[PDB]
């Protein structure tokens, strides 16, 4: 359906994201929820995979939106809610990645504290606060979703833009990326002081691949988000941006399927549990 290269590439990427994310996130959620216990390490993975799975379930909505090239067939409430739940899952994933990196740095720079005052309850409370923060960040996007025809069909879309885009950029890219890089850099730096010199080759590789996947999945999204403000529409400089935006959103959604292979499936014990639970 209208196989322009900007949109067909996004469609291929998005369908692949669904295909390798629905089972990938589903098996991890099942294992960590029922097959595995509820330790503090597993709480972050459980919530992150819940967010990624919610993104995957809401992914066929984006597939349909790309297939129909707009022309929202649903009502006002559906177009005010679905492109808010999508953002909720997408950015709760980012906040949970940041929380994972923060906990990884905390169990290394404050180990005495992370034994007394670090329980499953604290992790659950932090995850709940993360979900609340994601919902609060999705309010400017639940307020301004409006429907007007303006064409043969009724395309759905919309300070109504600069404030929401800038706040989303800051709180979903800068603080997450800065905190992730600082936490993983300090973990790598600490691992060069004794008993860890044998490591810091596996740990550094894991940290750099995790941060690199996060950044190559979430930098085009924000780059195009801030470029849309400067570049006005109805011009090729901006028409091409709108055409390629589908690929950027597809990459940000693809992170959701990349995550289970980077966080839960690096835990060799969880690898064995998933291997045993995948037979039969």
């Amino acid at each position: 359906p209208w196989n322009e290269p900007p949109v067909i590439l996004s469609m291929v990427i998005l369908s692949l994201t669904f295909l390798l994310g629905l089972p990938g996130n589903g098996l991890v959620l099942w294992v960590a929820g029922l097959k595995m216990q509820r330790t503090v390490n597993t709480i972050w993975f459980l919530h992150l995979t819940l967010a990624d799975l919610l993104c995957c379930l809401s992914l066929p909505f984006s597939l349909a939106h790309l297939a129909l090239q707009g022309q929202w067939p649903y009502g006002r409430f559906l177009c005010k809610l679905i492109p808010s739940i999508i953002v909720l899952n997408m950015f709760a994933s980012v906040f949970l990645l940041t929380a994972i990196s923060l906990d990884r740095c905390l169990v290394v720079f404050k180990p005495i504290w992370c034994q007394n005052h670090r329980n499953v309850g604290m992790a659950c409370s932090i995850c709940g606060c993360i979900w609340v923060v994601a919902f609060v960040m999705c309010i400017p996007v639940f307020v301004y979703r409006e429907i007007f025809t303006t064409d043969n069909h009724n395309r759905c879309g919309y300070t109504p833009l600069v404030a929401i885009t800038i706040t989303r950029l800051v709180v979903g890219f800068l603080l997450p990326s800065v905190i992730m890089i600082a936490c993983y850099s300090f973990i790598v730096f600490r691992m060069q002081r004794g008993r860890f010199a044998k490591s810091q080759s596996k740990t550094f590789r894991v940290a750099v691949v995790v941060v690199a996947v996060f950044l190559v999945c979430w930098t085009p999204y924000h780059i195009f988000g801030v470029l849309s403000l400067l570049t006005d529409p109805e011009t090729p400089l901006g028409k091409t941006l709108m055409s390629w935006d589908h690929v950027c959103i597809a990459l940000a959604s693809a992170n959701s399927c990349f995550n289970p292979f980077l966080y839960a499936l690096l835990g060799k014990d969880f690898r064995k549990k998933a291997r045993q639970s995948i037979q039969g």
Binding site: G70, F148, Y158, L161, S228, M242, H246
Partner: peptide, 9 residues
């Protein structure tokens, strides 16, 4: 006015 945004923006 209207700036038809994609689903995930």
């Amino acid at each position: 006015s209207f700036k038809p945004m994609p689903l995930x923006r």
